[PDB]
């Protein structure tokens, strides 16, 4: 037999970030698990999956990317679960 | 039998990241587990996968990526629960 | 049998990162656990996959790629659980 | 039997990392394991797999890589967990 | 019978970073464990694998790599876990 325990007694005030997963047994993607607990943050995708024959014949393309500019990311306990405890964000 | 037992008794307060995963048995992807507990910051694709037969002929590109600029990132206890702790961001 | 015993007995408050796998038995992926506690800063993916036959013939590219600039990535405690500990960002 | 026991017998504030992985038994990649606690800063990934047939003729090619600016990593405790420490970040 | 028994005793406050394994039994990757506790700063791969048949003929290539200029890592206790410690970052 199978069996899986998690957390099973718990008493007093944790503070948990659970992920569990049991298993039994152009772009293709099949019979996956993505991004249980994922955090993307100034992430920047331009040209993914044009298509097929894009710019086949005779294609003159000037890309110019520019990501330059004043960007603040002030986080504070990021996938950090706590107990008991002090977060603070000043300015 | 497969058993498996994670954390079974907990009585007191503790800040935890659980990640259990049990098995039992142009881009291809099948039959995976990707990105459980996963942090991008500033993470750039400019050109994943344009396609099939792309600039075929007689192709002409300028491709410039300026990635330069003022960005703070600024983070406290990034994956790293706490108990009994104290985090503070101050600016 | 198959017994995977972890952390059964917890009294009093600790910070734990918990990553438990059990087994039993032009990109191809299969059958894979990938990045379970996975922290990406500042990576960069320009030409990932473009695609079959690119820039087939006759191709003048130009590829410039210039990443430099003012950033600052000010980090405490990444991936470092902690517990009756002080962590401070001070600017 | 196959037994495999991990910190059965936890009483006060541990702060731990844990990565257990139990067996029983272009690109190709297969039934592994990759990038349990990864902390990727700074890694660039320029070209990694065009395609088949890339720059198949006739290709003038000016690559030109520059990563050459002001950038700060400041980091206290990356993948070290702690317990009744003192962690600070002071600027 | 295998038996495998890591920590099972811990009573006061160990700072552990904990990996255990155990085995019963034109790039291929197959059945392998890689970067458990693996931590890769300022790492670059320019060309990795470029495809079937690059540059085949008549190929005028000017790969010019600059990497230069003002960057600065300042990490303490890097893969180090400590308990009563002090670790501080002063700049």
């Given at each position: 037999?199978?069996?899986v325990k998690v957390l099973d007694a718990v008493r007093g005030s944790p503070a948990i970030n659970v992920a569990v997963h049991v298993f039994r047994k152009l772009?293709?993607?099949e019979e996956f698990?993505?991004?249980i607990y994922k955090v993307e943050i100034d992430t920047k995708?331009?040209?993914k999956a044009l298509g097929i024959?894009?710019?086949h014949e005779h294609a003159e393309?000037?890309?110019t990317a520019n990501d330059s500019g004043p960007r603040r990311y002030t986080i504070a306990a990021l996938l950090s679960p706590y107990s008991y405890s002090t977060?603070?964000?000043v300015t």
């Open positions: 037999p199978l069996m772009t293709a993607e698990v993505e991004g995708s331009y040209w024959s894009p710019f393309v000037v890309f977060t603070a964000v």
